[PDB]
Amino acid sequence: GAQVSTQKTGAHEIHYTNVNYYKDAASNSANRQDFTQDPGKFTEPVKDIMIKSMPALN
Amino acid sequence: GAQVSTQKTGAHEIHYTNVNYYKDAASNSANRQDFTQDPGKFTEPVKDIMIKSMPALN
Amino acid sequence: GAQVSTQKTGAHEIHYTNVNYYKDAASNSANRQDFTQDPGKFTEPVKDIMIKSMPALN
Amino acid sequence: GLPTMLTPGSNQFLTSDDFQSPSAMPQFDVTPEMDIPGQVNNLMEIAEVDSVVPVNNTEG
Amino acid sequence: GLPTMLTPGSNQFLTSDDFQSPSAMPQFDVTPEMDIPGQVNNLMEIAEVDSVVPVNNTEG
Amino acid sequence: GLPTMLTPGSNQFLTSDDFQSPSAMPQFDVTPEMDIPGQVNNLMEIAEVDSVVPVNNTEGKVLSIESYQIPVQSNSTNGSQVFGFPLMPGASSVLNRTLLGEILNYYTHWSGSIKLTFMFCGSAMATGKFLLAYSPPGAGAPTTRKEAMLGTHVIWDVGLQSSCVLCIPWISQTHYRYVVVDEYTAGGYITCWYQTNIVVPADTQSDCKILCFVSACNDFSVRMLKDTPFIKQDNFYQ
Amino acid sequence: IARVADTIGSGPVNSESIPALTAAETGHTSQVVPADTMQTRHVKNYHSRSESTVENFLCRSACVFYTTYRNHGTDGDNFGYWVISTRQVAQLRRKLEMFTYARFDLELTFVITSTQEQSTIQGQDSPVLTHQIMYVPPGGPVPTKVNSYSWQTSTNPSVFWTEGSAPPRMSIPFISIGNAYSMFYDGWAKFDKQGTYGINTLNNMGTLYMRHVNDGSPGPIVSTVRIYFKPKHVKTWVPRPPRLCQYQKAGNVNFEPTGVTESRTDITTMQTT
Amino acid sequence: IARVADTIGSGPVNSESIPALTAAETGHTSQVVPADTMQTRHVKNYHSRSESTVENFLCRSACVFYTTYRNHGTDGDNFGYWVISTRQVAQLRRKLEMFTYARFDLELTFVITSTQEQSTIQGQDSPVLTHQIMYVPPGGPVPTKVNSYSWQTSTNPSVFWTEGSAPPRMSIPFISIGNAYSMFYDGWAKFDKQGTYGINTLNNMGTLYMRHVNDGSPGPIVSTVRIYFKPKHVKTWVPRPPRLCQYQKAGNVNFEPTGVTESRTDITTMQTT
Amino acid sequence: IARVADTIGSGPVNSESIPALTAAETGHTSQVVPADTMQTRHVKNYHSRSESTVENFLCRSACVFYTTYRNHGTDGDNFGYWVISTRQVAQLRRKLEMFTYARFDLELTFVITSTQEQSTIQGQDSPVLTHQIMYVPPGGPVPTKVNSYSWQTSTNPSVFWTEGSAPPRMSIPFISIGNAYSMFYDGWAKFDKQGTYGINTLNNMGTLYMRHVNDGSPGPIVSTVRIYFKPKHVKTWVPRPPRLCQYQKAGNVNFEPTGVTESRTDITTMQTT
Amino acid sequence: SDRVRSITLGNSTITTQECANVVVGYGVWPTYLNDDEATAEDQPTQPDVATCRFYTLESVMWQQSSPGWWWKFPDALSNMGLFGQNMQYHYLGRAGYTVHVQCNASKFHQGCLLVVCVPEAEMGCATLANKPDQKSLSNGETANMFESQNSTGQTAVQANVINAGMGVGVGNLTIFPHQWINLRTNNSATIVMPYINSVPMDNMFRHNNFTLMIIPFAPLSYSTGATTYVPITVTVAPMCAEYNGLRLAGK
Ligand SMILES: CCCCCCCCCCCCCCCC(=O)O
Ligand SMILES: CCCCCCCCCCCCCCCC(=O)O
Ligand SMILES: CCCCCCCCCCCCCCCC(=O)O
Ligand SMILES: CCCCCCCCCCCCCC(=O)O
Ligand SMILES: CCCCCCCCCCCCCC(=O)O
Ligand SMILES: CCCCCCCCCCCCCC(=O)O
């Protein structure tokens, strides 16, 4: 049970291996590459869709 | 994910193994065997081909 | 790239494993079991075959 | 045992390292996760929100 | 990291050990080997050669 | 845990080791690479470029541009020498400060053939023939043109093509040589003589200049990195 | 990949669409890009947001407290204790308090250093020191002396450490009784609203105890233990404005009123700063 | 394989082809081999250029600075700092400056050594020392005392190290805002051209801070930290002539004019040297 | 398998074949086995020659030199150096000199030990010592002081070592410019035959430099470094008779004439010995 | 033959009957910045004819004791037509250059000039503590002269030609794209320089970042009665010039 993942490399011109040693999931290392984004919660929390090009208010 | 490469040995009369441990590509070891050569940039930067046996200037 | 070889054991009534870690062939361990023998260079350097049972000189 | 060689950086505490360590509380059963509103995964989701600018930040 | 236990013989210098060590000159390109006459692979090839015996090794 | 035994070399700092270490800045996103002109992958691509040689590095000339200028003039005798220096690209002061020699001083061993280009920077009405000779070691340095033509040489005829190349072939008993001066790895002697005279018409300058360039051939190579004796320091630059 | 958006090419416009005009009263933050109010070129942006994730922003070891204990004591009374909290330091407290709720595992690290004290007890030749950090969860028996029975640690987790070696480290899971750690609490502890008000109501994490396992030598010695927290496997909820005023207490959010920003000369001075 | 070219066999020649004659005015470097001006034999050359690659030429640990800090101080004011640069040493500066642009990762190593000072504080028996190197990027809060709050290192990367163990080492990626590190800059910092001129314009790497994590003991002690840089994963652009004159300053390329080479007696003396 | 030959069975003989008679003038060494001059039985010999290979005979760590350097010095001038050679010790020199040519890689190991010196500088409490061995190949800049710029080791390979840990070790490849290391050289360095004659002509290996990286403490200290060579991956050519006379110099093979063996009473005395 | 050559850029043309060849940078012809290399988002300006054309600088006079000259670019073109105009109104810029140095003689004249383009040619001051002032580094359209002796001055540049103002060996300058004007061989030298920098675009007023040096390695020489006025004219043309960041004019 070894996990081969992709290292953090540069763009515009590379794997590491991981084995878990302990029985608890808290003993693992950090989730350094959990890239998720949902900004709509805070920037567009309104009920109606509010298209950009249209006027906000009639 | 283990990489078996050829060691540096002598010519005229031999592998090592590599595993990456860290998540960043900068944590890796040096590229000791990146043998590339393009001397034409500095020694023949002229526009025309300039064949050797021919006279350089007419 | 692991090499499984036969250990040195006794005769008349047993493997070890080897992995290379470094990029240079000089970093390896010694060739403790390179058993080759050619004594004829020093003990029979003569031009003619010189069979044993025959007289050396006529 | 397995022959090993210690390399530079052994026994050092680098505050930004990713290693595994033993749990002081083995087999602990954490509370079940709950769906809370307003989860943040990136700090750029906070910078992308409007905030008032004190342009008239004069002395008084 | 990987949990490991140190065993007796650690940090000892035994003059007849077979280990791998780092090269102080990385990527050095050695001279090409040459076919020299008289290569010796075993010391028993030297003992199997005749040599004169000083049988008359008296005092003078 | 896994039983392990520590071996010699543990906790040692060898300045030429290849190991992996943790990044103090995890997940850092480097700037995107750009296509810049003039990428260098090998230092031998720099040594293979021509560079002017200060052949006239005499006591007063060395602090001036006249170090590079090799004086040639019209003579009344025959067979005179123009210059001469030893084939020591790493140790000779005639060569160790060029692009080729500056790179050699970072290394302990060299090998391969050398090129010596000569540009005739005189008038267009001037004419001359020159004997560019190389002599391997074992006998002394040649002292006359009769002794230089026994060795490796090229007779240079000046004309529309202003330059000429004397290729110093690799003739040694070892595969490499020492950058430092050593009697076991002597290199030989480079000499230039007059194969004829500098013949010039009236109202022209009899005195001319010649330029020397030195660059490595495609079989040139270096070995055993070291520090240079060229740069020094007494205390930290503030 | 937390890769940012590419810039799209845009030419001249003349139409009824009004991307620049909006109503900020709606609470909606406008999604205008530069390609809406000017002719842009095409840019393939390779920049990534990998470093502003909440895991990377928070996964840094930070010192949260240090205390001192001696070897001689009286009588004694030469040991250390810390009631665990994340609010006694300014730096880590402000990062954790950018959110209202957080769930994470911890990486706990200790840095123990010993100092020789002024005295006339020459000559001193003291063997290596060994320290014992004991964690007592809420309700367990507390050490009263430096040699009391509680140090047996039959069920209480303890780490023993000898000086000169790597600093000790262990992982702690998410241990709260709630579904998330609270950085902020806007209620009281008692139902009648008397008593403690605020985040101190939920602070029941426990206590750490430190001592020398060695018997005290003639030469006086004082040791200081630095605790370092590192959040791991993070999940944050409800971000809030960063703390502007300087902290005063650990139990509450009491502050001294502070200006909104640094002032400048006038409304048009470009010397900012 | 960075294998050099084999030598080809060549016999006598008599023709119109003129490989030895050329025009050096063109800027083209002639590609003449020895097989063009003499009868050569065939040589299978097995020599390789593996050691002159820019990675191997540059991938050597080099000391770039060392500074000292004490344990007593006043008041104090017993800590060290270094504004990071690669131009305070002659040896590594000349290697990096053979190119105009370089991109690489670094391997950073420290060698910390402590020395006992002259005093009459007998007798001294001091426990092992622990050092803390903190890196403060540009703009972050600076340590003002040896015990100030900035040493908490909530977000600033720091390495803790106890004496007697392996020298600490960590990797740094390529961190510049440009697409390449500049060894040379031929402009000013301000648009009006007043102010700093040259490579100092682009020096904004940060600062390192060092201290003893231990409290000071009675016996005086001074520690020196040696920083070592090792370029990794190198890419170089636009090689330039090696520095001939001895360096004078770190911020600029100011020099004292030097002769082209070592002089000799005359144009024909073979005693060189 | 380096297994020796089995003994074949042989009965009585009466014939013209003469295996025991030969001509030693031919230079041929007779290949007579015991089965040619007596009735032998059959013996399955399981003895092997695995221990007399040139690799096993030579692959033993051997001390080749040790030198001392101090911490105080003047002024200073407290550092060590060794011009590398294999001919300053008797034991390893005689093994290597059983052959005329050898090609091998080396395993280099150091054993550094420090000693306290007589003084009245009480009291002394000195932190752990760190040593730096620098290797300067031929032509490189030499250290002139214990703190000169050459110790930066920008390109020169150096190993840093703290006391109390495993002795440092590194591998060196085969580095000669010839196709083999020469143990013996029967020529001069200059073509006119003036100057150095013999194996010293080819000795251009380099020099090692040692120092304390620590600043000197009040208490005097002297350290000694022992260098150990271990041939690896060996290839030997042209064996020659072992050295009979005791060595005198390192550069040459000069000797004092010695008897062929130990003498005995007469030609028939069995008391040998 | 290969000695003749013509170069047409914009409404300008240069003919040469006695040249050597064209040296093209590091083998790279100048091009426009691509979408995957760009970082500035606004649509760039490309005049493409009014700016990418030939401009002739101020001529110098080769004398028997002239150590050499140097120009900084694009500071030399900062007042040349519409190329200088776009530089003033824009924050960012980008160009490559065709450089044509021209010096003719009488076939009885002798002397060899080194013509080289040095990228990022940072120059040292004559006083080690100070920095060279703005005018000593680049006089714009006028050449700054090398000296054949040590320079003096608080803000002066160390213009001793043996180190070329940079602290290097002047004979080692052939590592950069260079050419030679040898009076017996050719009367001109031309180099095509691509845009070289650590960023895709830069400010054209606070950065150069290449210098043009003209150093006589063989001095000018002639017999009495020959023409003694031998000038060297420099004609540069920006190639593929584009601009970003329009605003009010300056500097
Ligand atoms: C032997 C060492 C064991 C120590 C175990 C320590 C466990 C204590 C819990 C630490 C987590 C506290 C986090 C609270 C967060 C908050 O209040 O905002
Ligand atoms: C705890 C240790 C962390 C230290 C991190 C140090 C990062 C500083 C950046 C080093 C690279 C500087 C290279 C500049 C090259 C140049 O200017 O030519
Ligand atoms: C930091 C340590 C590096 C030291 C590198 C030492 C390399 C020196 C060469 C050793 C081999 C010499 C063998 C010569 C054999 C002979 O002369 O017979
Ligand atoms: C961090 C790099 C770890 C390298 C691997 C060392 C640990 C042992 C790996 C054993 C792999 C087989 C186990 C499995 O089946 O998953
Ligand atoms: C430098 C030599 C490293 C030797 C290997 C030790 C590390 C563990 C190897 C585990 C191999 C399986 C992982 C994988 O699938 O790639
Ligand atoms: C000396 C015994 C070494 C034991 C093995 C430890 C090193 C890691 C082995 C990894 C094996 C997989 C690598 C490979 O594919 O060759």
Author numbering:
A (entry chain D), B (entry chain D), C (entry chain D): 2 to 14, 25 to 69
D (entry chain C), E (entry chain C): 1 to 60
F (entry chain C): 1 to 238
G (entry chain A), H (entry chain A), I (entry chain A): 11 to 283
J (entry chain B): 10 to 260
Show passages lifted from the paper.
The genus Enterovirus within the Picornaviridae, a family of non-enveloped viruses with a positive single-stranded RNA genome, is comprised of more than 100 serotypes. Human enteroviruses (EV) are presently classified into four groups, Enterovirus A-D (EV-A, B, C, and D), among which EV-B, the largest group, consists of over 60 serotypes, including all 6 serotypes of coxsackievirus B (CVB1-6), coxsackievirus A9 (CVA9), over 30 serotypes of echoviruses and more than 20 newly identified enteroviruses. The capsid proteins (VP1, VP2, and VP3) adopt the classical eight-stranded anti-parallel β-barrel configuration with the N-termini residing inside and the C-termini exposed on the surface. Most of the uncoating receptors bind to the “canyon” sites of the viral particle, dislodging the “pocket factor” in VP1 and subsequently triggering conformational changes of the intact particle to release the genome, albeit that SCARB2 binds EV71 outside the canyon.
Given that three key structural elements of the VP1 GH, VP2 EF, and VP1 EF loops dominate virus–receptor interactions, we systematically calculated pairwise Euclidean distances between all amino acids for all possible (n2) pairs of these three key elements from 15 structure-available human EVs, which defines a k (k = (n2)) dimensional space delineating the structural characteristics of the receptor-recognition sites. The phylogenetic tree could clearly separate these human EVs into three groups: EV-A, EV-B, and EV-C. Within each group, viruses with distinct receptors were further grouped into mono-phylogenetic clades. This structure-based in silico analysis completely matches the results of experimentally derived receptor identification, therefore, it can be used to deduce the receptor usage for human EVs. To test the robustness of our structure-based algorithm, we determined the structures of three other human EVs (CVB1, CVB5 and Echovirus 3) and put these into our algorithm. The in silico analysis suggests that CVB1 and CVB5 are CAR-dependent human EVs and E3 utilizes FcRn as a functional receptor, predictions consistent with experimental reports.
